[PDB]
Amino acid sequence: QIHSRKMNVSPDVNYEELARCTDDFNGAQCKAVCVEAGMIALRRGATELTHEDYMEGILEVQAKKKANLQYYA
Amino acid sequence: FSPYVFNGGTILAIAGEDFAIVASDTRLSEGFSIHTRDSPKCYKLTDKTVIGCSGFHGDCLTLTKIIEARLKMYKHSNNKAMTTGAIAAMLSTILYSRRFFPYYVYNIIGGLDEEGKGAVYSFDPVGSYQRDSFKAGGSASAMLQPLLDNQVGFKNMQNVEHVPLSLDRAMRLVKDVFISAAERDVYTGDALRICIVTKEGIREETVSLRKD
Amino acid sequence: NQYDNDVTVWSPQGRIHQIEYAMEAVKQGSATVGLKSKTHAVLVALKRAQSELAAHQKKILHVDNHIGISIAGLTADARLLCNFMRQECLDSRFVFDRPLPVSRLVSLIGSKTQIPTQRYGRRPYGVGLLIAGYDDMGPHIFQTCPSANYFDCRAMSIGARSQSARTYLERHMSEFMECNLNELVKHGLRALRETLPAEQDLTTKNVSIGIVGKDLEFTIYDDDDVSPFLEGL
Amino acid sequence: TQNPMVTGTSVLGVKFEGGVVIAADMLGSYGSLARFRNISRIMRVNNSTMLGASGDYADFQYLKQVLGQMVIDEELLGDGHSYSPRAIHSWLTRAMYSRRSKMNPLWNTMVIGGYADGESFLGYVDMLGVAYEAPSLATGYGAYLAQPLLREVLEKQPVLSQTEARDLVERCMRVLYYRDARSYNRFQIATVTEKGVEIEGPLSTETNWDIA
Amino acid sequence: GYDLSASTFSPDGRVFQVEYAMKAVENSSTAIGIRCKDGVVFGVEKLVLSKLYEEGSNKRLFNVDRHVGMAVAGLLADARSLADIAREEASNFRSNFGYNIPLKHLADRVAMYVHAYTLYSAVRPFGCSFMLGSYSVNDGAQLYMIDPSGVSYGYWGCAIGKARQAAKTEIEKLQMKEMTCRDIVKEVAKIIYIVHDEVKDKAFELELSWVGELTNGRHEIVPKDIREEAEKYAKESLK
Amino acid sequence: LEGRTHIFKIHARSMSVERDIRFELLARLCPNSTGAEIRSVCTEAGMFAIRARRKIATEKDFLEAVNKVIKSYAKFSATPRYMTYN
Amino acid sequence: SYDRAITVFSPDGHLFQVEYAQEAVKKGSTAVGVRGRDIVVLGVEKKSVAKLQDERTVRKICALDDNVCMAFAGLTADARIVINRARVECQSHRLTVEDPVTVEYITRYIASLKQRYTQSNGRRPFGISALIVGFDFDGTPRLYQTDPSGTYHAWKANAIGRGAKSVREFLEKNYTDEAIETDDLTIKLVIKALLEVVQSGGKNIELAVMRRDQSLKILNPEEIEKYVAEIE
Amino acid sequence: SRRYDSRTTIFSPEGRLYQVEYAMEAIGHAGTCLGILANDGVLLAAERRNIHKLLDEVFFSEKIYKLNEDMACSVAGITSDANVLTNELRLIAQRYLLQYQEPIPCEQLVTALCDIKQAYTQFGGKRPFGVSLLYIGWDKHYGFQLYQSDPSGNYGGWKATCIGNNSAAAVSMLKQDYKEGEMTLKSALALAIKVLNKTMDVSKLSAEKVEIATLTRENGKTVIRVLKQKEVEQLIKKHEEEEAKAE
Amino acid sequence: DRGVNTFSPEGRLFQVEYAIEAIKLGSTAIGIQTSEGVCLAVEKRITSPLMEPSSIEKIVEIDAHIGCAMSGLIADAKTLIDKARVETQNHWFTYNETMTVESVTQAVSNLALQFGEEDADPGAMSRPFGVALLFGGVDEKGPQLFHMDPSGTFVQCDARAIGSASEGAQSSLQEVYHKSMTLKEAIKSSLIILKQVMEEKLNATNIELATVQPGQNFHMFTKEELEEVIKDI
Amino acid sequence: RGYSFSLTTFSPSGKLVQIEYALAAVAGGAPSVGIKAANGVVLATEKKQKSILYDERSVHKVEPITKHIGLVYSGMGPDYRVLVHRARKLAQQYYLVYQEPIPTAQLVQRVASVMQEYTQSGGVRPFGVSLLICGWNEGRPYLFQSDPSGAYFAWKATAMGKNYVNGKTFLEKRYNEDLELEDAIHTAILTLKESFEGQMTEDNIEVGICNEAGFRRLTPTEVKDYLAA
């Protein structure tokens, strides 16, 4: 909320769930989530950040390589 | 120390065009005494199969438990309930697994097959099994079998039409043969349990016999 | 770097990295949810197909007449655990002629799964489960993770993008106890939908349902059998 | 136990409206010698099950130890699940069957009584794995002396009261004392109800008429 | 790299794997235990990670035997495994020698089992500390604690977990020698509530158990009424 | 697969070709081939034409190129011992 | 006992130990084989006579049974072990099926053994490639090859070891029904193929010939010299 | 544990068993062992590498061992491995005699020992035996034989070969001085003396640094002898006189 | 270093993925499931003209109603094929019936991934099998086609292509496949795709084709039938 | 449950580094000497305890094996104890089988074979000890050495431990073939005196003899009486 209170936030953006999907995250990485939440909202031309933008941007900051993780389940 | 004891019991099974009857008495004995009067030998395996076990009771219980367990394993592994032929083959395999210490159990499997007809399988203690239109086993097998051969099988009779078996006639025959067996055999005659197997389901009947 | 190579090396922070990697492996699986009411327990899972012409992977499997499981993770280890569960239940029935309580089965699972986590050359079971069953103590839902830990939950979802489902369940947790079976299944399907990524919807080809209740042995609904539940969401 | 050493005589049992009652004399016979005369042959499995015994007393003590340990293990978990009388009966049957198959039998004949879920239980377990449930049970020489009286009374009146059941057990114990060479005057009575399991002290068949 | 296996000594003479195991338990919620004249009382601060867990789930208090309790801190899987081992040891002792296992003997046996896992590269040190409590007329109240290193010591009061130091300081003001279990339950509730950090931990549930004369020597969970009274006393204390 | 089928195009542009060359087939013959190993195939396939004295390459020339830069020099390589990043 | 995974997958999906076994095979002496109409011929290049060694104890061509023989390229000890295994299996097959072994059966047995070694624990892959020749009961001539990975194929004529590629090209260019018309033609084909690889020529080639009913015959130095002269 | 495992049964990138190669390299530092085959016997000449005024004379030989009534062997490499392999050879020969009631042919014995060595260099995780053995014996099938063995498990029959220090020089010299099929035992002994003289650059033979053994057939029974100081000194004197006469 | 059973930071077993990558070096194999039957095709990939194509057996028969197409490391598949045959015959011996395709694939998959390094078995496998197998056959449920990989995951596929040309063969199959297809059309489409992907010109001596139908049993197309089909290309 | 891989492996130049390091550890051990006389054998060592607190007679270095065999060592004491135990067990097994005392050479061979096992077996290190075996069989004295590598040699006189090269030079200068046991004892004590660094006393050293009577460790009084010279 400190680093996100400068760009835009829809009223329906549950930070509590965001703070739960991000575990073992140091403080600096937490800011990158908000920063990347915007760059990825800019890709799909818009003016409002949405929860799926934060969640989708969490992966980009987690820095985990694609591995065709699709033969599980 | 004898690892075996004979507890009596008489099994019967008749196969029809669209049904299958598995009958049995409800007397448990040990020597010259009576253990209980309400111990049937008929066990339901699936919705279209029934097994009757007579002989040494402990082996009967263990074999029934093993059969039920294996049925569940097959259902889980192959995602389909077993057929009567599968049960018969499995039982033949199980019995031979203990050939050198055999189960003292006489088994008669009665149920419906895939085509929807009646099927009755007889077994020996070691595993020899065959399909038959009707079979009786246990203490009074010798008494029951000839009558089933004469009436159901129309054997040794000439100038008699081979009318197909009817459910009512099958039930009447079962009751008559078991009453006759009770009148003579000491180990049977307490009460009769009949397990009818049809497309609709399995129906159970009980008939009183002479306690002597 | 050198402390994430085996399951018998403690990190200076007090963590076993192999267990964390197994947890991640489970998180990489497809979604699944589990609920319970005063009289029923429900497991709803989302199946995904590798290719358009491939059948969707099954997730809900039988264990006994009163226990089910939804898998999320490596499939071979899931089958191994399911076989162990089935054998344990069969042995309990054979010896005591009594259904095995779900809690004892989960304890056995924990004991089995802890052994690899302490011996050289072994790996954690890379699978997470959602056990549902009905015993003398009522409906039960359990969660098992690759680390030999189990949680008794009144509602929980695991797998990819499961946090949305967990948030929904926490929001609507106050009405699960006193709802009919249809309402409970609808809640589970709604959580599963909340897991989905916007441009997609629940369909008969990717949703599976499993219900166990007081007078209802465990059953699995798949293919056209799930249409009654979807019609209404 | 190929050669039993210290043996016990009959164990009686009858189920009434609200529970079951078990009886057994306190006597360990070393082959026609009242060696030990203050030994209890009844055990309290848990709050809803009690178990009598006959045959080798050492085997009975071993079973006591094993079953007590299982009950303790179940109680430790505190998960709200308790072994039912049927569960204990099945476990005992399986243990005896396994020992018989290994040819190292437990020379015992056990009677299990209990009252769970508002229903009474009364079971039998022989050294060969025979197991059955009947309204009244009598092991050893009771099957010849005491069982007939119980069966007659129960056939006349299927459901008994606690007082009637106790009177019947006392009369059967008196008959066994009269006509059994290995019986002892002192005996115990165990009753299970909704209140739990109660074991009565060393009662005596004081009603011993000796009109020669 | 001298801290990759339990079978290698540091040049200064330490087994670093055991230290890391100790650090693992230090990151768990505190669990204290107090010994009194009547018996012993155990309390565990159970963090509710989410509202989706049934109250009583992930219970950290076990009954290894009908007269011995168990409170654990650290990795819960290893705690459950060691609880199973303690149950097995008690059952074997009862079967062989014919009477309830003394608490000191059980603690020594379980500690030696833990120690056996701190010598070889084929196994890793247990990541859990726990305390056993028992009461008998012949033996009296007893309380022991076993660490990953396998050290067994008898305590009048002990705490294991994150807030071990604070719990120990607060326990030291209890003069537990001449008190009964009734007062100790309330004192344990107050101590657990004091040590708990609301800023870090979201919410928690208090789990209590006891074994003493009042319980006729049987380890059992405290009745809900006494738990509620103790919780109310704890709230009143933090005014 | 879609990638290394495109690396071949970006490195085989300013060279003489049979036009009708199954570049996709060549792409699938070197599954885990780095970008460099693809330029060495293109820069070597035409090498087999300078030796024969021809001036226009051919698919058979490229196939011999893959047999030398991908499967014949695989003894040394770098990909197998680096994807572990160690 | 020892239970370390000797053969393990590598990124890019390779069994590096199998590749090293193939490399070791490549460093062994050359071998050749040709399938004739009524004759199967096996040749081998001798690294050095040495003028002191006993040629009997260095034979690279050995008879598994009456109707099968092989030549190996690679490590001698691994070859000997595989030969002993094949011989015992051939005798076991004779005992059980009561008929002589077929070339396919024995080559499959060797391939299965090599695969088991390349997928077992605490075991190194067998570093040998084998050419198996013989006549089945039907009389049809056969020729098979084996590789450390455990793969076997039927060849009209193959060559393994140093110069495998050169001899393979020579055989591909110069194999025709005319060349296999007569037994002498097949022997000349094998010798000519070897001469493309061996340097000294003549004295450094050992040829073994098996016919339909006759057992294995190892050509003496005089016969090989006569054939070499006829080739010139 | 993987870290401490030396991985002694792997293939190097060039397909070489490194441990076997290093074991062979070890043999190069052992004593010189020589064997010549004659039409009427076989002989082994070995360099007595241990030489000191304090060592006592025990046993019938230092490096030449007896395996059967008609076999003997000489070892170069690590002595303890040599002892282990000699014991195994004796056991194998006695097992064969018990099974067939006939002495084991030399080829079978060398094959059995080489099978043991191969097993050690293929599976097990243990270091290979660092010893090469020279065998001499007689059998009813092929008469006199002379065999060689290496850690890899490879054996070959030879008419004259050398293993140990300066083996290549001995092999070259023998190649030039060996008349196949026309050598008596006396000529073989003279050739062995020359080879040992030139191969041991350290001074000249002193009759104490040489251990010569002979295998011959007499009256239908094999005879294995170890030459005494007198005959070795006589051979040295004859060789010196012959060299002087040549020059 | 990095034993066989080690989990990558993303939760994917290293050896399983390394094996999966090895499948891409195998020969293309195509399997199409049709109501009339199931077809299996594979490229033989002849190295030299001297090698006899008849000796390359990439399609094998497990029983009279089950066939398997292989791709990858051929040697590793032999053990799995033998296990499948033994399991089928054991099922026939015990239950006097024919094991379904799903059961055979399940057993073979259970065999896969049972590899270990320490405390596994006296002769347990060291590495996973580097083969992807296509099981095809006719059972009580009609024709079935199953795809199994080293991971032990098996999925029923209407039309699945494995091997080097898997990507692109799958796209073509999606393009041409439809539910109401006939066996002749399936064979023709498979041959067209195989011709497109194969390196060398397609002919009767470098492809194998097998069909299983409800009436007929496992039939491996001989040379004459293959030439008849290729006539139209 | 125990490493199955050998910890001793061949270095590129062909040496077994572990065995060389074991020999270095031996060289770092205490001095020892053995002289073979014409009517017996003698073994001598040093026992300078770190302080007066140590009990000199608590533990012995010259330990008997059988009635006619004894041994001494130079290296790690615990390894010497293990080897002594194994040697005694082997001797008793031989006696039971053959009903005759184990000859010195045979015991040497068996002990050496025991040592070799530890330089090839899995998860073990070479014994860091070298033994000197003395005995009297077949009416002649016997003296043997056995190194960690498993090789054994027959000696007329030898010395191990610190400054063993200097001791061997001393022996080569002073040894005579026709000595008697008493002169051998004196020579051994003198050789020990060459590298001792301190005042030699009855408790500082140990002496053992082996003659027709059998093996026996000399008492401190006899050692003192010999020490007079």
For residues H77 and B126, give the distance between their C-alpha atoms in angstroms, rounded to a whole number: 66
For the domain spanning J1-229, the CATH number is: 3.60.20.10
Among H72, H38, H76, smallest CA distance to H163 is for H76
For residues C130 and C208, give the distance between their C-alpha atoms in angstroms, rounded to a whole number: 14
Strands (E), B31-132: 33-36, 42-46, 49-55, 105-112, 118-123, 129-132
Q: Chain C within 8 Å of D47 (Cβ-Cβ)?
A: no
Q: B164 in helix, strand or coil?
A: coil
- Inter-chain CB proximity F25 and I199 less than 8 Å: yes
Question: Within 10 A of C137 (CB to CB), how many other CB atoms are there?
Answer: 12
B contact test, residue of I87, I88, I95 with most B CBs within 10 A: I95
Listing from the earlier edge strand, what are the strands of the sheet with G217-218? G157-160, G31-35, G39-45, G205-211, G217-218
Signed CA dihedral, J217, J220, J221, J222: sign only: positive
List C-alpha distances in Å: H173 to H27, H34, H162, H184: 20, 12, 10, 18
Q: J180 in helix, strand or coil?
A: coil
CA atoms within 13 A on the CB side of B180: 14
Q: Chain I within 8 Å of F28 (Cβ-Cβ)?
A: yes
How close does chain B come to D129, measured CA to CA in Å? 5
Question: Within 10 A of D86 (CB to CB), how many other CB atoms are there?
Answer: 19
List C-alpha distances in Å: J25 to G223, J28, J30, J47: 65, 5, 10, 18
Among J5, G17, I127, G27, smallest CA distance to H11 is for G17
Q: Which helix (H) or strand (E) holds E46?
A: strand E39-47
Residue in I106, I151, I155 nearest the CB of C55: I155
Q: Which chains touch I (3 or more CB pairs under 8 A)?
A: A, B, C, F, G, H
Check if the beta carbon of residue B14 is closer than 8 Å to that of residue B120. yes
- Inter-chain CB proximity E124 and C148 less than 8 Å: no
As to burial, measured by CB atoms within 10 angstroms (0-12 exposed, 13-18 middle, 19+ buried), residue E166 is middle
Amino acid at B192: L
Residues of E with CB below 8 A from C110's CB?
77, 80
Task: Report angle CA G72, G77, G80 to the nearest 5 degrees.
Answer: 60
> Which chain I residue's Cα is nearest to C76?
I152
For residues G164 and G127, give the distance between their C-alpha atoms in angstroms, rounded to a whole number: 16
Q: C60 in helix, strand or coil?
A: strand
Domain boundary assignment for chain E: 1-237
Check if the beta carbon of residue B198 is closer than 8 Å to that of residue B19. yes
Q: I38 in helix, strand or coil?
A: strand
Q: What is the CATH number of the domain that holds H99?
A: 3.60.20.10
Q: What share of chain B is helix, strand, coil (3-state, %, to 5)?
A: 30, 30, 35
Structure tokens belonging to residue B72: 């569940």
- Inter-chain CB proximity I149 and A71 less than 8 Å: yes
For residues E202 and E29, give the distance between their C-alpha atoms in angstroms, rounded to a whole number: 12
Locus of tokens 């530092």: H29
Residues of F with CB below 8 A from I21's CB?
31-32
Residues of I with CB below 8 A from F1's CB?
167-168
Domain boundary assignment for chain D: 1-212
Task: Report angle CA E184, E187, E193 to the nearest 5 degrees.
Answer: 140
Chains B and D touch (3+ CB pairs under 8 A): yes
Check if the beta carbon of residue H19 is closer than 8 Å to that of residue H188. no
Check if the beta carbon of residue E137 is closer than 8 Å to that of residue E103. no
Structure tokens belonging to residue H190: 């003279």
Residues contacting residue I88 through CB under 8 Å, at least 6 positions apart: I62, I63, I66, I98, I99, I104
According to DSSP, residue D141 is labeled G
Among J210, J222, J208, smallest CA distance to J68 is for J210
Amino acid at D144: Y
This structure's resolution (angstroms)? 2.9
Amino acid at I213: Q
- Inter-chain CB proximity F28 and I2 less than 8 Å: no
Among C177, C204, C206, C172, smallest CA distance to C190 is for C172
DSSP result, B170-200: HHHHHHHHHHHHHHH-TT--SEEEEEEE-SS
Check if the beta carbon of residue C222 is closer than 8 Å to that of residue C208. yes
Length of chain C: 233
Catalytic positions of D, please? Answer: 1
Q: How far out from the chain centre does Cα J78 lie? A: 14
Locus of tokens 């267990």: C19
CATH assignment of D1-212, among 3.80.10.10, 3.40.50.300, 3.60.20.10, 3.30.10.20: 3.60.20.10
Q: Chain A within 8 Å of I18 (Cβ-Cβ)?
A: no
Task: Report angle CA E161, E165, E167 to the nearest 5 degrees.
Answer: 75
Considering the domain delimited by C1-233, tell me its CATH architecture: 4-Layer Sandwich (3.60)
Among G203, G219, G220, smallest CA distance to G51 is for G203
Check if the beta carbon of residue H43 is closer than 8 Å to that of residue H57. no
For residues J171 and J192, give the distance between their C-alpha atoms in angstroms, rounded to a whole number: 11
Q: Which helix (H) or strand (E) holds D89?
A: helix D85-101
First to last CA, chain E: 51
Q: A54 in helix, strand or coil?
A: helix
For residues E168 and E183, give the distance between their C-alpha atoms in angstroms, rounded to a whole number: 18
What burial letters (b/e) apply to B55-82, b meaning 16+ CB within 10 Å? bbbbbbbbbbbbbbebbbebebbbeeeb
Angle between helices B141-151 and B167-184 (to 10 degrees): 150
Angle between helices D57-77 and C102-114 (to 10 degrees): 90
Q: What share of chain E is helix, strand, coil (3-state, %, to 5)?
A: 35, 25, 40
Among G110, G78, G26, smallest CA distance to H121 is for G78
Q: Chain G within 8 Å of F1 (Cβ-Cβ)?
A: no
Check if the beta carbon of residue D193 is closer than 8 Å to that of residue D115. yes
How close does chain C come to B65, measured CA to CA in Å? 7
Structure tokens belonging to residue G160: 């393994």
Domain span at B180:
1-212
Partner residues linked to C176 by β-bridges: none
Torsion of the alpha carbons at D96, D97, D99 and D105, rounded to the nearest 10: 60
List C-alpha distances in Å: E53 to A15, C147, C156, E77, E162: 21, 18, 8, 18, 22
DSSP result, E185-212: HHHHHHHHHHH--TTT---EEEEEEEEE
Length of chain J: 229
Among G140, G132, G44, G39, smallest CA distance to G89 is for G132
Check if the beta carbon of residue E91 is closer than 8 Å to that of residue E42. no
Residue in I6, I112, I157 nearest the CB of C5: I6
Q: If you count residue pairs, one on H and one on J, with CB atoms under 8 Å apart, how many are there?
A: 99
Among H179, H155, H192, smallest CA distance to H46 is for H192
Q: What share of chain J is helix, strand, coil (3-state, %, to 5)?
A: 35, 30, 35
Check if the beta carbon of residue C97 is closer than 8 Å to that of residue D90. yes
Signed CA dihedral, E49, E52, E57, E58: sign only: negative
For residues I121 and G120, give the distance between their C-alpha atoms in angstroms, rounded to a whole number: 11
Check if the beta carbon of residue D73 is closer than 8 Å to that of residue D67. no
Q: B38 in helix, strand or coil?
A: coil
Residue in B79, B83, B89 nearest the CB of I94: B89
Torsion of the alpha carbons at E43, E49, E51 and E56, rounded to the nearest 10: -30
DSSP result, J132-167: EEEEEETTEEEEEEE-TTS-EEEBSEEEESTTHHHH
Q: A11 in helix, strand or coil?
A: coil
Q: What is the CATH number of the domain that holds I190?
A: 3.60.20.10
For chain F, what is the largest distance between any 2 Cα atoms, rounded to a whole number of angstroms? Answer: 44
Angle between helices C75-96 and B57-78 (to 10 degrees): 160
Structure tokens belonging to residue E69: 């309790």
- Inter-chain CB proximity I10 and A64 less than 8 Å: yes
> Which chain I residue's Cα is nearest to B86?
I95
Which residues 3-32 in chain H show a CB within 8 A of chain E?
3
Contact residues of I toward C, CB < 8 A: 1-3, 5-13, 106, 109-110, 112-113, 116-119, 147, 151-153, 155-160, 170, 173-174, 177
Chains G and I touch (3+ CB pairs under 8 A): yes
Structure tokens belonging to residue J176: 């005579």
According to DSSP, residue E215 is labeled G
Q: What is the CATH number of the domain that holds B135?
A: 3.60.20.10
Among I130, C33, B36, smallest CA distance to D124 is for B36
Residues contacting residue B139 through CB under 8 Å, at least 6 positions apart: B8, B9, B10, B54, B185, B187, B188
Check if the beta carbon of residue B25 is closer than 8 Å to that of residue B42. no
Q: E3 in helix, strand or coil?
A: coil
For the domain spanning E1-237, the CATH number is: 3.60.20.10
> Which residues precede chain breaks (C–N over 2.5 Å) in chain J?
none
F contact test, residue of I18, I164, I200, I201 with most F CBs within 10 A: I164
Cα-trace Rg, chain J:
18
Contact residues of B toward D, CB < 8 A: 1, 3-5, 7, 28, 30, 33, 35-39, 56-59, 61-62, 101
Check if the beta carbon of residue B193 is closer than 8 Å to that of residue B42. yes
CA atoms within 13 A on the CB side of D168: 29
Q: I156 in helix, strand or coil?
A: strand
Partner residues linked to E71 by β-bridges: E61, E131
Which residues 77-96 in chain D show a CB within 8 A of chain C?
77, 79-81, 83-84, 86-87, 90-91, 94
First to last CA, chain A: 35
- Structural domains of chain G sorted by starting position, each given as residue range(s) with its CATH number in brackets: 1-232 (3.60.20.10)
Partner residues linked to J34 by β-bridges: J43, J158
Strands (E), chain D: 11-16, 19-25, 28-29, 34-36, 42-46, 49-52, 110-116, 119-125, 131-133, 136-138, 186-193, 196-204
Number of compact structural domains in chain B? 1
List C-alpha distances in Å: D48 to B101, C104, D13, D71, F76: 38, 21, 15, 12, 76
Phi-psi region of B9 (alpha: psi -120 to 50; beta: other; left: phi over 0): left
Among F10, D92, C156, smallest CA distance to E54 is for C156
For residues D32 and D24, give the distance between their C-alpha atoms in angstroms, rounded to a whole number: 18
Among G46, G55, G57, G52, smallest CA distance to H173 is for G52
Q: Chain C within 8 Å of E123 (Cβ-Cβ)?
A: yes
Q: How far out from the chain centre does Cα B17 lie? A: 18
Q: Which helix (H) or strand (E) holds E183?
A: helix E181-195
List C-alpha distances in Å: D207 to C12, D150, D164, D179: 81, 19, 17, 15
Q: Which helix (H) or strand (E) holds B147?
A: helix B141-151
Task: Report angle CA E54, E57, E58 to the nearest 5 degrees.
Answer: 150
Phi, psi dihedral angles at I112 (to 5 degrees) = -70, 150
Domain span at H90:
1-247
For residues J34 and H56, give the distance between their C-alpha atoms in angstroms, rounded to a whole number: 13
Q: Chain C within 8 Å of E87 (Cβ-Cβ)?
A: no
Amino acid at H94: Q
DSSP result, chain G: ------S-EETTTEEHHHHHHHHHHHTSPPEEEEE-SSEEEEEEE-S--TTTB-GGGG-SEEEEETTEEEEEEE-HHHHHHHHHHHHHHHHHHHHHHSSPPPHHHHHHHHHHHHHHHHTSSSBPPP-EEEEEEEE-TT--EEEEEE-TTS-EEEBSEEEESTTHHHHHHHHHHT--TTTTSSHHHHHHHHHHHHHTT-SS-STTEEEEEEESSS--EEPPHHHHHHHHHHH-
Number of compact structural domains in chain I? 1
Structure tokens belonging to residue A29: 């990485």
Task: Report angle CA J186, J187, J190 to the nearest 5 degrees.
Answer: 85
C contact test, residue of A15, A62, A72 with most C CBs within 10 A: A72
Q: If you count residue pairs, one on G and one on I, with CB atoms under 8 Å apart, how many are there?
A: 94
Partner residues linked to B135 by β-bridges: B13
For residues E168 and E40, give the distance between their C-alpha atoms in angstroms, rounded to a whole number: 16
Number of compact structural domains in chain H? 1
Residues contacting residue G51 through CB under 8 Å, at least 6 positions apart: H175, H178, H180
Angle between helices B57-78 and D85-101 (to 10 degrees): 100
Domain span at I37:
1-233
